[PDB]
């Protein structure tokens, strides 16, 4: 129990932090990855002067603060502001003292060696956690779907990745990163919806375009004869009621937004798209392992939640793969937390105890120890 | 096989569109039922305040 | 094949249980939304009757 | 001054200074802001017991039926007085579509009224319906008009300045003699 | 000559229409983009009842009419009232019959496909012009400065834009629109001038604040130590004599008004400003084309005429751009008509004849034909 209860799992994202206790089924804490700094001197009624704001208080009060994102494209870019988000996570969100809890953290696919050593330096030397561990994100997603070999298409708020994993070892030279994700996708909907003849003028109009994207957006299979369908004008249309009455209608654009993930050309991106990239990762891997990867395309991440994403991907890679092959696109329902759940499982596991980096290992080996 | 599997992506598609609309309509019924005890409660109070002020 | 067809009678079964519960919950939301315009409407009138009697 | 003219125009004379001053006491006591100012003029014509006679410094019982509300309809229609500006309710609204988007539900549910001229009965009901019908239906409108409103400003100062926490914002002669008028200016 | 003389160029703006014959050096007709509708029944002495008023007669008689602006932020918002401004342009202003003149029109940067088809529908079907053509405004401005690749900062009465153009094709995904322009700018001067202790009370006081803005306003470079200069009180001050004697003095505010274009915060705008936006457009474009755009910042529009606008912009983007770069801010003198002049050149050109959309093309292809 000492640490059975006690292991923490913190998944640091570009848009959201997911956090909680190893053992739980889902994150106890989910909140924006921002750190707000007040543009002016003054106070809220009853509070003192605050130097900084994090998560939702930074979002809610955004009009008087300069908002900053510590993690650009999955990589920690500002370490002063990240130590601020961690502090908030332990002390306010989970309300635990960190110096008696083992902490499993996550990093990104080709996270620079030096960063994995730096967050270890900050975990052990400024938070004084007993022990910690850094798992790679795609690797926890895979594992949370039971398996050990597969290829994960991972897509969240600032990055998309393909991480081919074989008997647990993520394959460095076959990993692909596509910098277009849910953030890019909300801003494109924004324009095709103002372009539908609308105005997201106040900040209460801006924010909810993102809630339109999440609730009403679709990834149609045969996106071709779906536009064609749009035109005959079926009961395909969908009206959402705004903060007030102002019933906005979205028929068609509803799927023009996730067609951006297959066609980056919709947004002036010259890069290849999700399905081709799944494939290219795969023809960059060893030959003998390619049947395995093809029958185990595990999806994880908030942006892979658009319904019919899996069917489109299913047919997208069947028709690029040699017919002798078995294609299989696994997309679980909890996928917006796969990464986290894979960490919860792993860290609560009976056999993981012997991989925890302890302060004994650290004080004796330097940050190098956990770096592997 | 192509026919059982095709009949399928369509039945599972329909199942998920119907589960999505029931989740949305149940969220809407809970919100309109909660707007309610509130509308009706301040009502018992506004009508009582009237009978006292009229007196 | 046995697996796609079996996965099936289960997905179609789930689809019909969910379509049945959405129909019931949508009928309940329309009735509670209709109890409403009624509660709130006699309210605009009871509160107006108060502001006039208080004046 | 507008009541003055619609009342001389009713066939009267506020000739001496004891006639002038009391038009203002007529405005305060007998004036109204009708909701549906449209079919209130219409009502005036059928001539109901809507009329209201005031007794002057002497006997001279003056009657004011109708004009009684034609005076505060000036606050919604500035055109009654050769003003080309917009009126109170539109202006409430325009202020609001000039603010941040996320704060507009707050402002709409908290239209607080203060000032001697917002005391005309039925001002709040007219404003209530004036902005509901300009605001997006998804919105909650709420026009707060307290009874002491001719002193809201003052009372808010009385509260604040007698408050336990305000002591640390008082600009003292120490602050001033040391920082110049700039100190309190903020 | 048939059409060498005969091509018309009509530039539709948010505040002004500029019109004339292809060939001329400047617009034959310039007038407000209003349509007045009389609030009361009655007549002027010697005239009949008029249902409507357009341009200057609507401005001059504004006290008895309800004025309406057909073009909101560069986009045509009311098509009944726009056909009225066109009618006025052909028949009264240029006094030509449209059915024997080819007409080059202009549209805005991301003008909805459907509008370009609608004004074509109205040009050919209600005015019966022989042929027409719709050019994008920034694109005519660039071309009128000789070149084909550059980025135009275009700023008039209701909109500001940045339109990066490469070998003639305006780059859709890199275009930025900032809804703060000369209209916003006259109203801000208004307040800093009443705030100087003044009153623009009658309509003859209102209108001339705009003539103060045009004549006396400046964009200072080092707007910092220009306020500082204001205080020492040099002979920086400037008094303007009103319709009557009432000599009003404007020392300082003179430049506080165009500092609004770099600092939108002066007016409760949270958007970025002109120079940052020039830049952001540029780091949204392809990499290999960014040296070109930087050496070709062409300015056009009435609001970019404030003296010292170019020097401030020069230094504003040098200091944001990588030092290996050449910055070059072209601001020609005729810039309040760049757009129009670019159209005059192009439409009088020897090679343009083969791009005119003719009634033959239209009656045979539908509005789609000109839409491209």
Swiss-Prot record, chains B, C:
Source species: Oryctolagus cuniculus
Family statement: Belongs to the tropomyosin family.
Biological role stated in the UniProt entry: Binds to actin filaments in muscle and non-muscle cells. Plays a central role, in association with the troponin complex, in the calcium dependent regulation of vertebrate striated muscle contraction. Smooth muscle contraction is regulated by interaction with caldesmon. In non-muscle cells is implicated in stabilizing cytoskeleton actin filaments.
Protein name: Tropomyosin alpha-1 chain
Subcellular localization, as worded in the UniProt entry: Cytoplasm, Cytoskeleton
Self-association state and partner proteins as the record states: Homodimer. Heterodimer of an alpha (TPM1, TPM3 or TPM4) and a beta (TPM2) chain. Interacts with HRG (via the HRR domain); the interaction contributes to the antiangiogenic properties of the histidine/proline-rich region (HRR) of HRG. Interacts (via N-terminus) with LMOD2 (via N-terminus) and TMOD1 (via N-terminus).
Domain notes from UniProt: The molecule is in a coiled coil structure that is formed by 2 polypeptide chains. The sequence exhibits a prominent seven-residues periodicity.
From Swiss-Prot, chain D:
Signal peptide region: none
Cell location: Cytoplasm, Cytoskeleton
Post-translational modification, as annotated: MICAL1 and MICAL2 produce the (R)-S-oxide form. The (R)-S-oxide form is reverted by MSRB1 and MSRB2, which promotes actin repolymerization.
MF (Gene Ontology): actin monomer binding; ATP binding; calcium ion binding; calcium-dependent protein binding; cytoskeletal motor activator activity; hydrolase activity; identical protein binding; magnesium ion binding
Region feature Interaction with alpha-actinin, mapped onto this chain: 172-184
Family: Belongs to the actin family.
Purpose: Actins are highly conserved proteins that are involved in various types of cell motility and are ubiquitously expressed in all eukaryotic cells.
Protein name: Actin, alpha skeletal muscle
Gene coding for it: ACTA1
């Amino acid at each position: 129990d000492e640490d059975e209860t006690t292991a923490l799992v913190c998944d640091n994202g570009s848009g959201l932090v997911k956090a909680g206790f190893a053992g739980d089924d889902a994150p106890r804490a989910v909140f924006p990855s921002i750190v707000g700094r007040p543009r002016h001197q003054g106070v809220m009624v009853g509070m003192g002067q605050k130097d900084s704001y994090v998560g939702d208080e930074a979002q809610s009060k955004r009009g008087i603060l300069t908002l900053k994102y510590p993690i650009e494209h999955g990589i920690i870019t500002n370490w002063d502001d990240m130590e601020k988000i961690w502090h908030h996570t332990f002390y306010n969100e989970l309300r635990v003292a960190p110096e008696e809890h083992p902490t499993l953290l996550t990093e990104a696919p080709l996270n620079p060696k030096a960063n994995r050593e730096k967050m270890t330096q900050i975990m052990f030397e400024t938070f004084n956690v007993p022990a910690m561990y850094v798992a790679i994100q795609a690797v926890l997603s895979l594992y949370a779907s039971g398996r050990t070999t597969g290829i994960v298409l991972d897509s969240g708020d600032g990055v998309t990745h393909n991480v081919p994993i074989y008997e647990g070892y993520a394959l460095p030279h076959a990993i692909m990163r596509l910098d277009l994700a849910g953030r890019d996708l909300t801003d494109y909907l924004m324009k095709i919806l103002t372009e539908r003849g609308y105005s997201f003028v106040t900040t209460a109009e801006r924010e909810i375009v993102r809630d339109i994207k999440e609730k009403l957006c679709y990834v149609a299979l045969d996106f071709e004869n779906e536009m064609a369908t749009a035109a005959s004008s079926s009961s395909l249309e969908k009206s959402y009621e705004l903060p007030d009455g102002q019933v906005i209608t979205i028929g068609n654009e509803r799927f023009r937004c996730p067609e951006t993930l297959f066609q980056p050309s919709f947004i002036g991106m010259e890069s290849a798209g999700i399905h081709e990239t799944t494939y290219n990762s795969i023809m960059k891997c060893d030959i003998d392992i390619r049947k395995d990867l093809y029958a185990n395309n595990v999806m994880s991440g908030g942006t892979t939640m658009y319904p019919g994403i899996a069917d489109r991907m299913q047919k997208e890679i069947t028709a690029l793969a040699p017919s002798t092959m078995k294609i299989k696109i696994i997309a679980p329902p909890e996928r917006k937390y796969s990464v986290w759940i894979g960490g919860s499982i792993l860290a609560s596991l009976s056999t993981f105890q012997q991989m925890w980096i302890t302060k004994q290992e650290y004080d004796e080996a330097g940050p190098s120890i956990v770096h592997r | 096989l192509k026919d059982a599997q095709e009949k399928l992506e369509l039945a599972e598609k329909k199942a998920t569109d119907a589960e999505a609309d029931v989740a949305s309509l149940n969220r809407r019924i809970q919100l309109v039922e909660e707007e309610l005890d509130r509308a009706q409660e301040r009502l018992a109070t506004a009508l009582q305040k009237l009978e006292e002020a009229e007196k």
